[PDB]
Design a protein around this ligand. Structure first.
Ligand code: NA
Length: 156
């Protein structure tokens, strides 16, 4: 029914983890029948690629199944998804640049649902160490938990 799209740049680190974390939060709240999650990237360079092995490893250690095949955002995503969540500001403006005016209200910064971690973005962990991957999960656990609450309260 309600369809949620999580968007980063490559759809190999951040947004696959966002999808996995959000799926878990939804399952925890017994709302699996009501929500569908997906992820995509603003860029198609990595299209067809498995999630980054480090994110899969860190994901698993944190209790998540990170399992995605990278895909680019397509124009129909703006129509077909109910809400779209950008991992960082770059993703956010890219999405808005491509989004028809009538669907722009669907697009949010992931971090605008953080209530604990003070951060301006879900930082790209690709060129750092394992700590950067954990940081992404930290931010997602904060934001995704508050997001499910806002969705169920109808606050969007
Ligand atoms: Na995919």
């Amino acid at each position: 029914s309600m369809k949620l799209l999580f968007v980063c740049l490559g759809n190999i680190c951040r947004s696959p983890a966002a999808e996995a974390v959000m799926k878990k939060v939804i399952q925890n709240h017994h709302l699996t029948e009501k929500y569908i999650c997906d992820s995509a990237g603003t860029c198609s360079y990595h299209e067809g690629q498995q999630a980054d092995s480090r994110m899969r490893k860190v994901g698993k250690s944190r209790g998540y199944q990170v399992d995605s095949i990278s895909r680019p955002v397509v124009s129909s995503d703006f129509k077909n998804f109910d809400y779209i969540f950008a991992m960082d500001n770059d993703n956010y403006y890219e999405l808005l640049d491509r989004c028809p005016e009538q669907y722009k209200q669907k697009i949010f910064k992931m971090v605008d649902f953080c209530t604990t971690i003070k951060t301006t973005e879900v930082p790209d962990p690709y060129y750092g160490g394992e700590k950067g991957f954990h940081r992404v999960i930290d931010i997602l656990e904060d934001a995704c938990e508050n997001l499910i609450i806002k969705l169920e309260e109808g606050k969007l």
